[PDB]
């Protein structure tokens, strides 16, 4: 009562033919695009396939691909025994020959260190590989209990005296922690025809966008869209929003700003200018100050934007009245 | 049969529930004023706000006056709950009630709130005054 076909297992003979067909494919794709077959590479292949078979499907897994068989197929679906039927690995009948073969090596290392007999922080800012990464190294499915047990054994190895061989071993299972630098990207300092220094930066609040041009030396003259700021912004709260960047760094009356804000309303345009001024003013302040701006909210774009209306309800969140029952 | 026995793996209600609640509170208060239940339970010096028996009679809920310290209350909770099964035994054995429901211990922090209000209230500014099953189709060749 089974019609669903067996999950396909790939013989080494099958993958071997898939690699000869791919190798002949590269020579043909190279001949089509007029490139040299010897130097034709995986990057050139992907670019050629995108030109010859343009697909605009959003998901990239569904687009045409001519990749090396090692990539498209799973890495190790090969037979685990020979013609006679004798498995190749002495731990085959465990069902996790690769997980237990690794736990066999690390347990033997631990025993030699304990029998044979400094700071253990040889590597810092590193993490243990996640289960998904481990499963990729072993090429076999692991459970959470199997991963948890593997880490405990690796930790015990670090606790004990470790020669350079052990340190290299544990290194394989340590992945450098991603380094996201939460530090503002300082803008360059250009020079005008007059020779005065000035920096420029963009800012976006709601639908408003601004392009400020702060000058290193000035008397505090801010011009928005070729107008003064008291005229352009008759509301105090809009002017206070322009005061926040300079007042915070005690730099009032020391710079000359030229703004160009298009889009949005009065408050959204002041907010867009505030960010544009804070980002341009970074080039003329110390790095310790740039961090004080970043930590006071002056350098982060505000992500709050109007939410779309939903069909079947009065608003983005407002619902139609629940008729009286 | 000891192992088998002790493994144990497998308007009427309104007036009745105003007597069981009063009596159970009267009885459990006496149980906790002596080391009879345990020495740990005697030293906790626990007080009982009230007892509430469910309408189904599934459980008997005993409200005990919680204290200020969470650690003191967390300890008291564990000790009281562990002995609740034993406390029920003692009430059936002294013949307080023939049938007693599983005892559950609920916290009563209300006594702290009332003390707080009186503190503020004194300090407040009041102001101046068959066909398919059968082989017939199989044996006829239809299938």
């Amino acid at each position: 009562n089974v019609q669903a076909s067996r999950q396909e297992s790939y013989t080494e003979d099958f993958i071997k033919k898939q690699i000869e067909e791919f190798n002949i494919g590269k020579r043909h794709l190279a001949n089509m695009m007029g490139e040299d077959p010897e130097t034709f590479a995986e990057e050139d292949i992907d670019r050629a396939i995108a030109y010859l078979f343009p697909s605009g499907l959003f998901e990239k897994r569904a687009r045409p691909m001519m990749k090396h068989p090692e990539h498209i197929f799973p890495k190790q679906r090969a037979t685990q025994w020979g013609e006679d039927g004798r498995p190749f690995h002495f731990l085959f009948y465990t069902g996790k020959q690769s997980y237990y073969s690794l736990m066999h090596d690390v347990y033997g290392k631990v025993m030699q260190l304990e029998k044979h007999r400094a700071e253990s922080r040889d590597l810092i800012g590193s993490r243990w590989l996640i289960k998904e990464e481990l499963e990729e190294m072993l090429v076999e499915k692991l459970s959470d209990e199997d991963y948890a047990q593997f880490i405990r054994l690796l930790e015990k190895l670090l606790t004990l005296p470790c020669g350079p061989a052990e340190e290299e071993f544990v290194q394989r299972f340590r992945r450098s922690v991603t380094i996201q630098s939460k530090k503002q990207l300082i803008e360059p300092v250009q020079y005008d025809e007059q020779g005065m220094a000035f920096s420029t930066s963009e800012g976006r609040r709601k639908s408003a966008t601004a392009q400020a041009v702060v000058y290193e030396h000035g008397s505090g003259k801010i011009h928005v869209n070729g107008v003064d700021y008291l005229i352009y912004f008759p509301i105090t709260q809009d002017r206070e929003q322009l005061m926040f960047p300079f007042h915070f760094l005690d730099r009032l009356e020391r710079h000359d700003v030229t703004c160009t804000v298009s889009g949005g309303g009065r408050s959204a345009q002041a907010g867009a200018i505030r960010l544009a001024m804070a980002r341009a003013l970074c080039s003329f302040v110390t790095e310790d100050e740039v961090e004080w701006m970043r930590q006071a909210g002056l350098l982060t774009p505000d992500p709050r934007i109007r939410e779309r209306k939903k069909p079947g309800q009065e608003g983005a969140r407002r619902k139609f009245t629940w008729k009286k029952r | 049969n000891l192992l088998k026995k002790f493994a144990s793996k497998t308007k009427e209600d309104s007036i009745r529930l105003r007597v069981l609640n009063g009596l159970l509170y009267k009885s459990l208060t006496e149980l906790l004023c002596t080391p009879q239940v345990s020495q740990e339970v005697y030293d906790l010096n626990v007080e009982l706000s009230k007892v509430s028996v469910t309408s189904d009679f599934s459980a008997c809920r005993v409200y005990w006056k919680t204290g200020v310290s969470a650690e003191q209350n967390k300890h008291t909770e564990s000790v009281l709950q562990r002995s609740a099964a034993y406390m029920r035994h003692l009430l059936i054995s002294q013949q307080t009630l023939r049938n007693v429901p599983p005892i559950v211990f609920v916290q009563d922090k209300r006594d702290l709130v009332l003390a707080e209000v009186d503190r503020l209230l004194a300090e407040a500014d009041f102001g101046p005054p068959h066909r398919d099953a059968s082989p017939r189709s199989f044996l006829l060749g239809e299938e």
């Binding site: 509301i235 105090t236 206070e240 926040f244 915070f248 | 009332l114 209000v117 209230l121 500014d125 102001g127």
Partner: protein, 205 residues
Amino acid sequence: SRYAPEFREPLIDKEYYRKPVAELTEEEKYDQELKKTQFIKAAAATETSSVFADPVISKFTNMMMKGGNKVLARSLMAQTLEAVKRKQFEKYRAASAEEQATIERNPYRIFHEALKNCEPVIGLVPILKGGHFYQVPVPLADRRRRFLAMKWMITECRENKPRRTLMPEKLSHELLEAFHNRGPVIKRKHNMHKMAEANRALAHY
């Protein structure tokens, strides 16, 4: 919210960032180093390092705003402060040297001391038990106690005023009359406390 939970509220205190490193408590010192590896929310449109920004008054402005009309609500509060300053200047000039000392002409200090005089220590939460309404004495938090003072002021002026009077003229007359502990809002606080006394026995319920 469009801010992931990892984002941190911005700190807009000018003196705090410029303090000497040694003057900062190690707890505060730790947070600064930690925040260097965190995400910071963008500052609100009404959040500035201005020396004239008072959080209490800014909150009072938002509780008067209707339909997102902040310009009008801020204008009414600005007119109120001026109406209170002008009412004390007249009294100060028309008073003897001895009386002049007591008279307070700072509107920001009359506003804060007015609200504080209208804050109720205890509250009343209405409950229904056995088909009747038994409201019982309750204790109020610092947030609930402040909200009630502001709400009671904005509601006395909005409703119990003549038709042709304006909010800057009724609110000014109440901040000053509350500042002396004689206004109707103060009576609202007194009535709350006196009812709680009456319901002392019903606190158990």
